[PDB]
Amino acid sequence: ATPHNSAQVGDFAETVLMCGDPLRAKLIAETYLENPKLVNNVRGIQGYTGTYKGKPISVMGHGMGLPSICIYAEELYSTYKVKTIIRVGTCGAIDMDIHTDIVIFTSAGTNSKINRIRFMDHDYPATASFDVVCALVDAAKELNIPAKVGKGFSTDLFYNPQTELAQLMNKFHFLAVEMESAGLFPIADLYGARAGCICTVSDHILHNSFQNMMKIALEAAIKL
Amino acid sequence: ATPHNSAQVGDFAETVLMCGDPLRAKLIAETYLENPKLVNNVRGIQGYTGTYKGKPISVMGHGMGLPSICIYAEELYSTYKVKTIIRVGTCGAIDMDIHTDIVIFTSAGTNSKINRIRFMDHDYPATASFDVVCALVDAAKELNIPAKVGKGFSTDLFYNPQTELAQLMNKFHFLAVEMESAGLFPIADLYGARAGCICTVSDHILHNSFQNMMKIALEAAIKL
Amino acid sequence: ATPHNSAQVGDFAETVLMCGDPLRAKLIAETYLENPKLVNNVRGIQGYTGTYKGKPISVMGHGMGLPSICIYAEELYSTYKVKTIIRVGTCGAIDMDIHTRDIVIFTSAGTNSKINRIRFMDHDYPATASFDVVCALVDAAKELNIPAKVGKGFSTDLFYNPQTELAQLMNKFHFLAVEMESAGLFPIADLYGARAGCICTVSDHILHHERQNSFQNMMKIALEAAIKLH
Amino acid sequence: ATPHNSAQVGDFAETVLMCGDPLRAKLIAETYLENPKLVNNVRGIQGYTGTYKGKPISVMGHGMGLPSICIYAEELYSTYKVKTIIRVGTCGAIDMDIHTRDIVIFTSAGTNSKINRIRFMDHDYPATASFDVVCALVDAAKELNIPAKVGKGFSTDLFYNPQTELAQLMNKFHFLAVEMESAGLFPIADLYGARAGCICTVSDHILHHERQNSFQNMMKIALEAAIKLH
Amino acid sequence: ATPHNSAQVGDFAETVLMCGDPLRAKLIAETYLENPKLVNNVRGIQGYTGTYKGKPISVMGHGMGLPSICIYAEELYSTYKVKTIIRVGTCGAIDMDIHTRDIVIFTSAGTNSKINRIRFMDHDYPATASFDVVCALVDAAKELNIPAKVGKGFSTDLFYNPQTELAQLMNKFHFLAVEMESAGLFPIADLYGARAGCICTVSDHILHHEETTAEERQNSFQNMMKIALEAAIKL
Amino acid sequence: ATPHNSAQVGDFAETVLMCGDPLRAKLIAETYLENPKLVNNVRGIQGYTGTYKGKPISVMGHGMGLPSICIYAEELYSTYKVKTIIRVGTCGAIDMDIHTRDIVIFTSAGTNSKINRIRFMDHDYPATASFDVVCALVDAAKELNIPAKVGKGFSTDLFYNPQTELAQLMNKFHFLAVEMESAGLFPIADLYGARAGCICTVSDHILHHEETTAEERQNSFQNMMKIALEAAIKL
């Protein structure tokens, strides 16, 4: 019922986990949901609606990059009346004290122009919902997994011609880099809904985890 | 051998077709290649190396949006030594005289900041290779299929808050909108390689084809 | 010790509460701090150090606007070794469900200044309050039974904003409130690996014509939050 | 009929060849057009109409820079009903394989002007020559055995460019050459649903110190291309 | 009246001297205005109306940086009907032949704030002192007998400027000094039909400092106050 | 010498009058300079060196728009060692009390070109006329007995301006007129230590035109030429 989603109003749990990799969405179909009903495979995007400890979850891939996640997220909140999107994903460390760890974003800077286009060319600060951030932090806490908490940078360019930037992000204690959150968070605000992100280091840009990250995300889903 | 590509130097034909939809890459695996060898399924991205009329082709999905295609294309030209990328795809009409037709891009404007980042914040004109554009035009001509030739607009935002823009693109005779070419073309330039795009109207933003578009792209691949 | 501050090292506590009005700073020093010493009066800015429930605490004005709070915040984190600065201010409400004298706690702050674009290679820097501090303010307010909204704020360069359709747009994106300083504080604290946060009182609504108790309430939340952060 | 043009309707052919130097325009009128009538001399700009192999053709200067060619191109497409304007210019080569007096044909043109950002909601407008015309120029040059490179050009606002690392960057992206007008012509033609193209002669290399024949060669290619486009 | 000013139309004169430092406004009011009345002290900004050689004059602080002088300059012109604002403060040395305690008269000022871009469709607004005021200031400084350079200033949003190359660039283009308010004050005068000018004494030097003390920079810069008040008399 | 100028150091005087229209440079040279020598006519730009009341003067076209006056102003200051450039052209009426044939003296000029952003780290450069020249021009126009307004101009990159709201905005901020070269000419003088000023006569009006003919706008605007040459004498 949307150019990128065949599923119908109700086919989606009020809470969706989303990742970049569509095969990873399946992995957790599949490895945590009970009664994994496929609900979207347009563009092979692996949409599922299920339950975890009796609560209706969903998982789905979002594509690599802001423009992609901006498509999915807007559709989910608007059409499929989703209340909460948590991006579980991978990212690259900037902070010298973060290592191949779990990171929970409070916000995400960006080199994209998308937020300038939706905000009269001023600075929109892309902020994770304080609800969700707390939810993730807490869960991480119960399950006794260390998590870092802080800023992300959503890059439009995985191979960044602007090489002086990794260091500058370091200088300002940016935690890590990925390519989607700065797109998500303001869509969430726009629909009065909520979003958050987390959060695993799969490489360091200045020189188990899947399981931990997913238990935290799922435990957190529950509180929300 | 690249974070997004498991295949190896040689696994890719000097010429790759690429589309947004990874299931569509398969469709033409699959429907035109002979001896479809899978060469990449990281993130389910459907990479194939084959032959068409005895020439080594490849097909692959590129994701929706500049940041996505920028990842694939840069990797293909640099790592996998690809010489030519033709984006076969779908797009949305702006021009009042274009209808649910085939369009061949000579170039693509954009609301992305990616080209400003690679070009000292000046205007890079994202231009399809005149080679390829001619190749497509000619083929379209032999196979007796009408094609339109002209400008595209690569949007970062499928649901564009800036609603006055469809009309302004109309006023300047923009042909159609999609979300990838403006990312591609300058990468092509950067590696001294070549790229082009085309090209099918799947909706009009102001109010067979697959088969035709693919025969033109494949015929054209051959001349290149 | 700086062109804007005549204190020496040691003279400021590790936590400094700052507000725009230097006379409000003075009012706080006389009302909430015991044994307030005037440590800075350059430009009439009223900086004091004292204690609150045995814990060391400072208060100082910052003037109005990013440029001014940028001078004083960088000086504190850099010359004086401050660890934490909580803004205690007033703001104009935007979100239609926020009312005069309501109390807002900022997760982060948008801006129309060019300052962070200059600090950050012309990219979008998200000015975020430190997590600890947002939490401490939220805990304080719950312990004291003062209700507090949590959310994005917006720091404008222009109090009389000729961009008249901006208010609405912010509303559409659920910005709680507008003030004129947080977007500058946050990234400076990040730069000195220090902490910052901001708490405010709604003194007026920008979307439709609209005290002490409020001020008093915010001060308690800020001061108790300072205690927990120490 | 305009502040910059004293011709009336009818006075220009459907195809107008324009170059920066008004005396070059005059040189073209006297050398290639038969029965050249001076139709415009406001500001010394030298516009003529005549014929070439029985086909109607005009030539006029445009001055140096986007702003100037923007005045004259819009006036021609709008007041005079011109259908096609080919720039016939000189340029500085960039690409290391292009040499003095080589001939370049532009598929499109980058720019550092703000003009297209103003025309296009601050987005990236790709100034592209019309396909027909690029083709006609390429066909003409092949029929006449003059070799011609095809590629991106770049129109700078600043002949003496204080951005000294720009030349290299353009080279890295395989821009053929720099002139100071095409980026302005193309989008105006799009706006009047007309056609435009640009052909140039390399008068100098910007990447390392470096005639008539060349000029003559370009003129033939342009004039034959005009014939085919008619 | 305004949220930042508790006086009322009539309380301020038609000419107002302003500086960043309210304590320096207070020194001016005390050292030079016969019969100073405190007209406004919200935020401790020290606004006073008195008279100088028999003509009404006012003085008030404006705080540091564009956002702040913007708030006060616009209230003065709009609500309090002021006709002339002369800014008398400190810079900001860039020129190599200019030194601390030197005097500098701004014709205009560049900036790095988005403010003028925001009030002017994102183009380059020339923040320009009124020709009258420049001349007055220039005359006054020629009569009293004090040397003053005339030229351009630059209002920075960032006293601690991370762009460290910018100072040499300004030097190439021969800017005189750097401050933090004039680029905001001039387009506001333009917007209200009123006049504005800016005179400042050098308090440090950015290329080969050089310095100055909080006290001497608060009390030791009479002269600019002198030229400013003589200039005021004429206008 | 330069690619745009075939004269040589010495051929141009130290003061050059310039206008967009080379035919108007040629009228000035013919109507006013004793013993005009044609020093430069590459691109038909009409540069001449002669003398006026016994002082050396020069005159040359500069073409329309920032990119062009930029090319010539920089060659004059850099290679030909010029000391002063006075631009005498047309505008550009914005102010409602200004009308065709009226005279306008620019203190500075806003712009919408990226040029000043590019030579100034992307901030707001105040493109400012030299105070000397403004004064000279102002004096000359007071002596000869001709009325002239002093104020700000705006140099547009787009004579046909698609931003149709911009003219009223300029009006709010009281700009005098609109032209297409001054914002480029002033920072170049600054860069070379030299001086520049701009005087123009109103050739059309943007808010309630009003017009003028190619001929009267080419030949009928002596006066500005008069003030400019009197001003030149002083400088």
Ligand SMILES: Nc1ncnc2c([C@@H]3N[C@H](CO)[C@@H](O)[C@H]3O)c[nH]c12
């Ligand atoms: N070093 C790094 N730079 C930028 N992005 C990432 C990522 C994330 N993984 C995908 C691209 O590899 C994309 O969806 C990002 O969110 C992992 N490592 C990264």
Ligand SMILES: Nc1ncnc2c([C@@H]3N[C@H](CO)[C@@H](O)[C@H]3O)c[nH]c12
């Ligand atoms: N109306 C329209 N607006 C923008 N984009 C498109 C597209 C293309 N299809 C994908 C998104 O639906 C993406 O890869 C685009 O290239 C089709 N129709 C479009």
Ligand SMILES: Nc1ncnc2c([C@@H]3N[C@H](CO)[C@@H](O)[C@H]3O)c[nH]c12
């Ligand atoms: N409605 C409103 N719009 C913008 N700013 C504010 C403020 C804050 N108070 C000072 C100026 O009023 C300044 O320091 C701002 O932080 C209070 N209400 C506001």
Ligand SMILES: Nc1ncnc2c([C@@H]3N[C@H](CO)[C@@H](O)[C@H]3O)c[nH]c12
């Ligand atoms: N090296 C070079 N750099 C920039 N521009 C050019 C030109 C062109 N000739 C005129 C100025 O020289 C102007 O109209 C430009 O189009 C020729 N060579 C060039």
Ligand SMILES: Nc1ncnc2c([C@@H]3N[C@H](CO)[C@@H](O)[C@H]3O)c[nH]c12
């Ligand atoms: N080096 C310098 N950089 C920037 N600004 C200044 C100033 C001016 N004095 C105040 C605080 O320094 C501020 O209001 C500025 O106007 C003096 N020296 C300066």
Ligand SMILES: Nc1ncnc2c([C@@H]3N[C@H](CO)[C@@H](O)[C@H]3O)c[nH]c12
């Ligand atoms: N309405 C108007 N808009 C913009 N520019 C002008 C001019 C000036 N005259 C030349 C061509 O019109 C150009 O060189 C400008 O300097 C006169 N009237 C103007």
